[PDB]
Structure 1
């Protein structure tokens, strides 16, 4: 299987990338350096993760060392919810560029379809704990994203956590100039996403699977929760293939024509997670993994559920 997938902007995107949510700022520079040294060419970033400066130090050092050329890297970041206003989008993108020490992003995503009140707080709350919305709709935010392409700041734009009706809203936008290249959504054997993936792929939108290992370090983890890495059924498939459970969980979305972005700051695991191009899951393996769906989400947030554009009511 090829290492990159063709996007609808004409560029190629590596199907395996390194995630950086929760990667501590004192560890993520070495994580990204190791990742690039062992073959990763795609890093998934976001302003809200608060570690883009440190990710950028690694990228810049590997460019300076000539381990890789800039054109060989595929760097992704995301517009946070408090920057959905027309007059804030360019500055948000430029801050991310400055932190990552880049002149352009390969892909810039609307992180969530929900706009929040601008300000210093990433989750502005009213006194009862509800997030305070912005009245800026996803279509105007999309037009602002299109401007970034036309100013040379980003090569591609896309969306994240958009449900099928929200994707449709963008695709049906009056005067749409650029289609979204990517929809980045949660996807793993407990949230298999058949309907949304089919829809996006049918429209030429590439899907990126996040939390492919079930995000065991998510901060709201109840150890009551189901655990992909510990599921004996998935462990059995891994054993059959002489691979780790994580390697099976990463190969699974690859064989669905998805991009996948496992996170690690552990050098041994960063390398392990990349060694997934030399085995194949059978169709029976794939269908068996799909059968484990239970519509379980890592990423949901109670404080935002009354937002008009909350994506997971549908």
Structure 2
């Protein structure tokens, strides 16, 4: 099941989130991406920052080599890190990701964040670079066939308007990948994006990995919310399946990270049931402006 992007390419609506903290051995990324493909995931989300493009690439290549999937069936996303915003560092950063994953192209290449950082992963230091020139440098990557589609991540409406109003724009972003879950449902930004034929893609849709680095151990646990639990019991699914289903029904493409074999196979059940309009309204009622990640921390 895919959504048609504003450049005519197709994005599967359920994506596999690949970030794991650095204590997790790099071999697990290879193993779990194999299991995600086996389970039916076809959209795989990575980034230069994640230090796993070699192993996620190896997984995709492994499953093409054995005839499980064709390259054209996989939608692979990477992201341009903030130390590479300067327009001349963009095409080289993408070629580096392609070398690492040994792929010929990415289906999607994102500006990871609107912040720019001193060229060199977090030097300790910022750097004024015009996100609109960072964008023309992405656009060429699409012209060059190295990214089928281009988009952004962690942009608000103003920062999207900066690219959409750019004089001489050739390619709109196809998406804006942002934190998005029932405690922070982004309903205004989503309406804006819909009006511009920009797909919102939700990350931390399951409430985040609650990593000590960024997540206050006191903060509410999304998947223990009594609404998502009441809906889980009502449908005989799980709160994580209700959280994912919610996004699919409001026209959001959703990511789901899991490094656990049963949970990876469970997540693909999101396509087996639907939420009623009253169910959707109850989840809508959860909105509380809770950010599990704050780029101001990292």
The separation in 1 between residues aligned to 2:188 and 2:2, in whole angstroms, is 23
Moved more, 14-23 or 39-48: 14-23
SS at match of 2:272: coil
* Alignment counterpart, residue 155 of structure 1, candidates 99, 123, 148: 148
SS at match of 1:225: coil
Paired residue for 1:64?
65
For structure 2, list consecutive stretches of 5 or more residues without a partner in the other structure. Answer: none
The answer to whether the aligner puts 1:285 opposite 2:279 as a matched pair is: yes
The answer to whether the aligner puts 1:248 opposite 2:238 as a matched pair is: no
Q: Deviations over 1:8-59 (max 9, x none)?
A: 1101110001001116322111111011111110000001011111111101
The answer to whether the aligner puts 1:93 opposite 2:87 as a matched pair is: no
Instruction: Please state how far the C-alpha of 1:93 moved relative to its aligned partner.
Output: 0.3
The separation in 2 between residues aligned to 1:274 and 1:248, in whole angstroms, is 12
SS at match of 2:146: coil
* Alignment counterpart, residue 236 of structure 1, candidates 230, 240, 243: 230
Paired residue for 1:308?
none
Higher normalized helix content (fraction of residues): 2
The answer to whether the aligner puts 1:5 opposite 2:7 as a matched pair is: no
Instruction: Flag the 1:249–1:303 CA change in 2: closer, same or farther, 3 A.
Output: closer
Paired residue for 1:55?
56
Instruction: Please state how far the C-alpha of 1:150 moved relative to its aligned partner.
Output: 1.1
SS at match of 2:208: coil
Instruction: Flag the 1:289–1:303 CA change in 2: closer, same or farther, 3 A.
Output: closer
The answer to whether the aligner puts 1:206 opposite 2:199 as a matched pair is: yes
Paired residue for 2:111?
110
TM, length-normalised to structure 1: 0.91
For structure 1, list consecutive stretches of 5 or more residues without a partner in the other structure. Answer: 126-131, 305-314
The answer to whether the aligner puts 1:41 opposite 2:42 as a matched pair is: yes
Count of residue correspondences = 294
Kindly report the root-mean-square deviation, in angstroms, between the aligned alpha carbons of the 2 structures.
Answer: 1.1
* Alignment counterpart, residue 186 of structure 2, candidates 182, 190, 193: 193
SS at match of 1:107: strand
